[model samples]
Target: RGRVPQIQARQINIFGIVQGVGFRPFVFNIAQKYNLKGIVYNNSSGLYIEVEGEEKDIEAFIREIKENPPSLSVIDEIQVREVEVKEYKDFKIVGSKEDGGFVPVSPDMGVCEDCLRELKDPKDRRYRYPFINCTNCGPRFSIIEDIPYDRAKTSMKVFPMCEKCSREYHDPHDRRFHAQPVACFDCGPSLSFVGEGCFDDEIKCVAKALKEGKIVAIKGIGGFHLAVNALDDEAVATLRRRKKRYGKPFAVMMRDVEEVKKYCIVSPEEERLLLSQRRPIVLLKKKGEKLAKGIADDLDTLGVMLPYAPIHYLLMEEIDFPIVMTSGNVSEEPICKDNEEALEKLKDIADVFLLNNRDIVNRIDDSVTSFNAGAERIIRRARGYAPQPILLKKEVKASILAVGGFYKNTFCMTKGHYAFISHHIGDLDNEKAFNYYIEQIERYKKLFRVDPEVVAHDMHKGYLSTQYAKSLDLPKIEVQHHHAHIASCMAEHNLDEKVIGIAYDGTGYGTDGNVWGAEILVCDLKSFERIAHLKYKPLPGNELAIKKIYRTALGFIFDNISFYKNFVEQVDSRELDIILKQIDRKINTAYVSSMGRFFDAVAALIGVRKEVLFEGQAAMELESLMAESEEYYEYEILKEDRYVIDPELILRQIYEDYMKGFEKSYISAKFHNTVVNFTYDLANLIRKETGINKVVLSGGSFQNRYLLRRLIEKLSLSGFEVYSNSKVPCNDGGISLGQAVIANKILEGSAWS
Candidate 1:
């Protein structure tokens, strides 16, 4: 007889995050499609699969591991090893084993389109329901308590899926099946009016309050928001005046993407994102359309999002125009989630309350962003993009717990093979924000039924997050601030290999014992060298540097070698005298590496940011001043391994040129162009040194649309795998995910250098 062939038996190990995101279901379908018999289960590390199949079918199955995943899911890697295949008749799921060595974080998912369609249908059971969310279209990290993503393990555990919904949730073929937050008007979280205001008709009372131009503190999908009609000039002015935010772009909401087309010019990609389940505020260009000058005054564009919730759908249907829905909190504080607490905190900010009885154990804000390089570039990621785990391509054994930076603080805990990153919590300095952080972290730990093997915190001692981790008495490994920034890009995109990462920020506690910002790192998570940095400058009155432009201007006096002395002498304004006095007498640059402060110096020296009402006011003003520019000037780039170009050189040269009569706008744009061009040069230098072309551009200052757009364009022109977090924020608010991504990498054997 001819040789008989036996089906091969195999036990495959998927080392990355192969659990929690429909991995089992996906593998189940794959096995059935291939006519293979297998048993799959999730352990602490990842997925364990035992299969019996012909060699060709098994090979094909392995090849398609992440080829076509659920749109919301990201895959890191899959490990396949042929063993004695299990002689199983059918593929099935086994209970979790609770192991380790395979935890790549999972990003919180956006709401799905099918769910959005369901939400828009008037005949749907969840019609007009503000809280109508399905597994495919609702909160994950924002509401999750722990692993495996069972409702009983989430903040929504209390709100059980009703029978009809449960049937849909459990049906494999149904959209709602296994959807964590699946609910209807009958079973989902509901709304009730609460506050100092009186109302018999809930909707009308809410409507009247909003129409009357009163601030309404409302509990939102992620946390809480203050809503007012954005079109009303008086309303926007009042809201802005109260929120303590001057000149920062305000995010508004329209009924749908179609309606937004009337007010703002929406690109095809931006339109897709606006209508998607994420429902993030996609920054769109302004048309010749009229909006109050007080709101988004003179800005080239306004940030807008369509309603993702059923309540939002219903309310927008009634209301004709967009509304100003910004984070509902005091400046620099986290959002207020509780009904009574919101009433208490927002008494001055909100005139009425549109809230509910459902308590939010944690608070997160909505994320805002603009489309860039044909992808979502996040300015903020709190509401629409939080709690979604990022799948890191790298593998690690240590179960690292990451407590993100101080501002926009968020905590991430990893156990076994899963890393659970919390939503954006505001600065912990606010007692409210502090308490909520502790509550959410503990809640997730308990829900996941896991404990950390090692805890990762920032090196800075001043951070409350560092202190909190210390209190846990866990083994703490401190990560350098900017290193994590680059790691964030790597983790989000699942780029495991070494890469050149340019991390720019306001300030990060550097390993060299200086406040670091605007750094270029040339290595992976295990090792990084700060190969290049902005020219050193004084902080100008220590902590006051962030606010004082003149102080920042004087900070350019590096080593008492004031190259700008001639420039100042040439200009010789009274402001320069005062600024010079502060510099000579007040020692401000004790320790700092902030590129943001440098911009302040250049802006003030040029007279664009003479007296800032807020931080970054000068840089923005300078950009606006240069908006319509045809003039160009060349800036000298000090070339080196870590070239640091002092702004005073540019200033002195510009002043000399100006003394000979150069237009300020032409010079201003030239200065901005210099910085942008310098960044490109350093990026190339790092790429050449590391032989790694992947570059992730992140930091708050990059939120400047002009700079970000230009920087990304240049990096791509160089043939690099360039990326940024469009799902998360570029600001400190979105720092946690970046922290989580980097910390996980270090745990997986990337050294902390």
Candidate 2:
């Protein structure tokens, strides 16, 4: 703001992500090369350079600074002019200062090529060093104790550098000159192999343990992992029994790109993602390249990842196999961190835990996801890719906190144009998970310097996330489930205009106190109005109904689902008991609608998912059978404004065919066609009423690619735009965006800027 002076010294201002990422040494080297003398000091914000030199040298210093800068530094904006040039002899990097404002932290980086060359070269001291890294590869945001990143300011300060590394770190011309995470092999943690009922470090020793079948606990950079070979049937079974996981697919870990192709076909797009900086586990379709049934049973796709840690590399090279590596958490707890805790907590589950004394500062679970047709969508965004901010589409006025849904959780905070959403926090019912949620919230706050003044949570007060917010005493906005589901998708697309939102999922707490899964809402980025829904029936026996297929089918029957009539006698015992008791009590469920329940009913009626092996086992099996069925069936949608088409009526007809002893596959196929027909009819009804041809199929139920493809065909043939989640997830995992949209509007711009 001051006027230019004659020549002695000048003050230069710099801002934006200029700290902790190697800005100082580069400035020192630049000044020396240009023969310009100045002193650069690290202030609360960024480097403050004071220089006194000839005009040409000063200009040269500024121009060359941008041409060749450090790998990590991003210079957003800077101010320079001559007030006076102070006489100086040398340029130096000064000490760091503290500040309360938001300062950017770099996300964890991938291993750079220079280090890779070192890893592969046997002559180099670091040859075959799995932990080989420079400033870029290892942990950053995860290991920090506080900001103003420097060796003394971080946990890494404990390991004093050896002479060779120390000299390189201090050398102004060296790339590792200012890199804080640097350490030689001797300074870092080492690896060992341990397994349940087994012990040894030989490659085959570990491989034999896996082949003979056992769960091994491998230590990772930030946490411990329970790993088993995915191809080993005995190991998968042993792991399932040890961890008490009855049905969920165990997330798999592969060596890298080439190994992944040996099992599942990799797409060109997927290939890029596997080798990307994030190095997340990408889910790909299976094509009879059979491994083990328990690894990913009843599912057509499998999740795979390459080793990101040094120990993982060692084990993979030793074992020569893809392993089932999952989070090292007890049933419902956060992943174990401490060595003693990992040992004691995993004593029963893991025979032995390969451990190191290094403290874990962050719990990074494997990022899991799949590709839809050709597009990829995230199921979980943790580990490498996490902590990266979801840039806001628009600015707001106040700090806003959006606590996402009950399942597939993530926390979101907004300040200015940046909205940071925590990676999947997991289900919040567990105490450890809940605490982790709080920790993540605080972590993002510190990173972004946000103090949210307003909060938005699911309308259900029973939700753990909601309870957390209520306890905080912040101003709150309660949002409806389906509404939030639709809002989440609309917000991600930055669609301010209204569109028909078809939200079909498994279960959501509805505003009317019913479990919602199927719903149609016309919405904008800000709000929506529910227009239609599937006929919903009471879920008998509370949450137990989810596991019992017939309880759902009976609900449909009680709701006048005649399509189920002829198949009644052949129903499972539990379904028959509920039906008889229902007839005896002369009681029926209240009238309502849900798309997920519809699938459940059809699955049970068609005898596809009769035993309910998994959550949507029957429904998924029904889709498979339906795809094989050549018959095309139709469903009638009544013209009532608030429509309720009884499933029993449709089931009654399907049952008659069951009496006719028709093929289950054929019936299943016809049933799929019926639902698609029903959806098409509904679409036509809505288009006639509102004339908006653009439609979006959202929620977890839509994750079924089979039905998704059919509906896409139906809508596209009708000359309409069919939309689904792209960059953002469609499941409740993406609900935080909608919560943001709703809370933003309710509080105006005052609560979340």
lDDT of each: 0.68, 0.70
- Give the count of colliding residue pairs in each prediction: 30, 30
* Candidate 1 RMSD to the real structure: 5.6
What lDDT is reached at residue 179 by model 1? Answer: 54
> Which candidate tops TM-score?
2
Q: What lDDT, from 0 to 1, does candidate 2 have?
A: 0.70
Which regions in candidate 1 have their CA more than 4 angstroms from the true location?
1-126, 146-188, 195-201, 414-420, 428-430, 448-450, 469-476, 492-501, 510-515, 557-582, 585-588, 591-593, 628-642, 653-665, 682-696, 715-753
**lDDT by residue for model 1 (152-249), tens:** 65677777767898788667777654555677767777678865556454556677777777788777766688888877888888888888877776
Model 2 alpha-carbon drift over 4 Å, by segment: 1-94, 192-208, 559-566, 571-575, 579-592, 611-614, 620-632, 643-696, 708-723, 749-753
